[PDB]
Amino acid sequence: SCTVSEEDLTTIRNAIQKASRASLDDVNLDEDLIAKCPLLKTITASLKSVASEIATLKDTGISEEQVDELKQSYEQQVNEIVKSRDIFEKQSGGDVMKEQGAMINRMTELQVQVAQLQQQIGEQTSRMYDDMAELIFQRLAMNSTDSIRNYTAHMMEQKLHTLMTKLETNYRIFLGALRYLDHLGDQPLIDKVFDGILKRLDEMSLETNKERENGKYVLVNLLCWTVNNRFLTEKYRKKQLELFRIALKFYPKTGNKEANEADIRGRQFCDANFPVNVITWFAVSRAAEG
Ligand code: NA
C-alpha cells in the first residue's frame, strides 16, 4: 500500500519539478517517505532514466540545437505533471469526496503520467536516432545501391569497417541504422551491411567492458533483425556457423545459461526467443557435436 502525508505530497511535487531542470538531478526523497509509499521508487526511477538518456544524446554527434529542443520538450511535459490538479491540488467542486482524492489514487495517476512521459520522450529520441544513423550513411556515401555500386571490394570492406566503428558505440544508433535500412528497402545495401556487421563482430577487440557491451548489443540485435524477414533469415542460414563462433566468443561459458539468457533478453529489442536460442542453445549444441 501507499500512504503519503499532506506535506509529503508537497515535497514529492517539488522534487518532480526539480528533476525537469537543466541540471536533471536525481529525485532525492527521504527513505521514511519512500517506505510509506514504495510506488514512488518506480516514479523516481523513470525520471532518472529519461535524464540519463538525454545525457547520452549530448555525447553523440547530434547538434546541441536539437538536444536543446528535446530538453525544453521534457521540461514542458514535466511542468504539465507538476501543474496537474488531479494529482497535487485539493479536490474542488464536484470532485469533493470522490475516491480519486485518496493518496493511492493520486500516486497511481502520477505513475501513469510519468510512464507516459517516458514513452513520449522515448518516441522523440528514437526519431533523433533514426536521423543520426541516416546522416552517418550519407556522410560515408553508403546510403544506396547506387552509392556503393562502383566501390571495389577493398574499398567496400574499408567503408563497412568505418561504418561499424560509428554505429557500434551507441546501440540506439545501431538500432536507428537497422530501421533506416528496413525503411529504405535497398536489399543490396542490407546484404552488404549484414556482411559488414559479421566481420566487425568476428574481429573487434573485446579487451574492455565497453567493447564487450558494444559487441553484445550488436550481436543480439543483428539476430533480432533477421526475425520475420525472409531475406535476412536466409542470410543467417548461410552464415550460421560463423554466428555460432561469434556467439561463443561473447557468451563463452556455456554452463551459465540462465544468466546469459537474462543478459541477452535485456539487450533485445524484438520479443523473439531466437537470439537466446542461437546463442545459448544452437551454438552450444553445435560446437559439442562431432
Ligand atoms: Na503541504
Swiss-Prot record:
Q: Does the keyword Signal apply?
A: yes
- Summarize the impact of residue 13 to S: Reduces the interaction with cuticular protein Cp19
Give the UniProt keywords, A-Z: Allergen, Disulfide bond, Glycoprotein, Secreted, Signal
Functionally, this protein is described as follows: Salivary protein that promotes mosquito blood feeding on the vertebrate host by inducing morphological changes in the mosquito labrum. Interacts with the mosquito labrum end tip and triggers salivation and probing. Modulates enzymatic activities of human tryptase and chymase.
Superkingdom of origin: Eukaryota
Effect of loss of the gene: RNAi-mediated knockdown results in prolonged intradermal probing prior blood engorgement when mosquitoes are fed on human host. No significant effects on probing and feeding time when mosquitoes are fed on membrane-covered heparinized blood.
Q: Report whether Disulfide bond shows up as a keyword of the record.
A: yes
How does the record describe the protein's post-translational processing? Answer: Proteolytically cleaved by human mast cell tryptase and chymase. Glycosylated.
Query: In the UniProt record, which is one GO cellular component term?
Result: extracellular region
Major localisation: secreted
What interactions and quaternary structure are annotated?
A: Monomer in solution. Interacts (via the N-terminal domain) with cuticular protein Cp19 (via the C-terminus).
> Which residues carry a glycan?
143, 150
Other facts: Antibodies against the protein are found in the serum of individuals exposed to Aedes albopictus bites.
List the cysteine pairs that form cystine: 2-37, 224-270
Its protein name is: Labrum-interacting protein from saliva LIPS-2
Q: How would you summarize where this protein is expressed among tissues?
A: Female salivary gland (at protein level). Female saliva (at protein level).
- Localized where? Secreted
